[PDB]
Amino acid sequence: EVLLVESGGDLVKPGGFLKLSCAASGFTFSSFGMSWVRHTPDKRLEWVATISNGGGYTYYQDSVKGRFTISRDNAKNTLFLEMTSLKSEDAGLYYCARRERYDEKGFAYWGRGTLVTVSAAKTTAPSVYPLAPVCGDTTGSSVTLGCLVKGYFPEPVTLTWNSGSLSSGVHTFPAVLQSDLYTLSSSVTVTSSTWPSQSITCNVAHPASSTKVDKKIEPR
Amino acid sequence: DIVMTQSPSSLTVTAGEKVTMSCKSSQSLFNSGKRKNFLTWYHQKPGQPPKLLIYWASTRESGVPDRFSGSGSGTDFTLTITSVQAEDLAIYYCQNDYSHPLTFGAGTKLELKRADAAPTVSIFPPSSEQLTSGGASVVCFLNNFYPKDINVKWKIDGSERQNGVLNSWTDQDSKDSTYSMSSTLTLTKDEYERHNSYTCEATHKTSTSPIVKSFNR
C-alpha cells in the first residue's frame, strides 16, 4: 500500500535550520512528484513546496521561497526539505503528500506528520498549583476541584487525577502560550461524598524537563 | 493567489440532516486541458491527516461514502452530506489544485446539536503555594454548557477587569456534546492583597442575567 513517513521535526530556535525527511513505500517513487503541506497551530493547512518526479522543477510557497529547499533522492525513496532561517510563523506539523501525476486529483496520499516548533524560549518546568474550593455548590451533591499548571516550556504535560483512576468528570483545557510560557488547567467534579474523605491528587509529569509533581488537593 | 472562502465557519448538525457548505474561489478553477474544475474537498479528524473526499468539484474518491456530493463551477462550489452521520464530524477544507500556489480554505467545522445547557461556574482563590511564590491566579471554570457561546467577565471590587485574563476553551465533548472553558485571572500577591470580592460573571444563551460567582477573602 502507499506509505509516507516523516522524520526530523524538533524544537528549533528561530533563525536556525532543521531538515525533514519523508519515506515512500509501496509505489514507484520515481514516477511521482511530491509536496510538503503544513498544518499550522491555527489549524490552517498551507502548501509549502512541490518537487516534480525527477527533481528539476521545484515550486515554493512565496513565504518559504529563498529559505526552504525541497530535494528527493529517487534512489533511496526519500523526499527532503532543508529549512533555514526559521521564523516563529513556520511552526506546525509538516506532512509530505504525494502528488497525483496520472490522476491529477489533489493530495490522496498523506503521511503522518513531523512537528516543527520554533521558539527561543528556554525549557522551563511547571508550577503545579492545587485549586480547591471555598465551598462546593452549597456543600451539595458535587464538588469541583482543579489543578493549575502555570508557566512551562515546552509542551506537553500530562495531567491525571489520582494517578489515572479518576477519568470521569475531568476537563483538561488546552494550553495557552503567553510570552514564551504555557499554562494548562484541569477540573475534576466528584460527589461531595468523595472529597475530602478521599484524597484527590493531581499529578503532572512534564517529560521534557524531568518533572513529575504530585499535588494533594488539600482544603486545610 | 486564488483565495478560497469557506462559509460558514461552523455548522451545527444532527444526524440524518442534509448539510451544505460553501467554497468560493477568487479565480475560476476550470482547467481547460482536462475540462475539469480543479477543486478538491478534504476533511480531517483530530490527529489524522486530511482525507480526500471529492476531487474535480464532483467526483467522489473511492471509499468515500455515497453521501458526499460535491458540485458547482467557476467560482462557487458546494459540498453536501445528505444524511450526515456522526462519523462525518470533522473540519472540511476545499483546495485550489488548479494553479500554484495551492491554497486551502479556512475550514468549515462540523459540530453536533444537542439541547442548550447552561454552565456550572465554579471559582477558586489563589493556592497558598502560588500566593507564596509572588502571584495570584484566581481561576474560574465554566463547565458543560451548550451552545459554544459564553462570555465571561471578571470584576475585582465591583470594577470590570480586562488585563491579566487568560481563557482556554475545550472542544465539543464526545460523550455529551458540551463545551467547557477556564478563565484564569493572574495578579500579584500584593495586588490581590489589597482587594476583596473577586467575581467571575458568565453571560450565556440560556440566561438573561449573568451567572455571578464570588468569593471575599
Partner: peptide, 8 residues
Amino acid sequence: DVPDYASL
C-alpha cells in the same frame, strides 16, 4: 521529469 499540472 514532468511539470506539475498546477504549474500554469
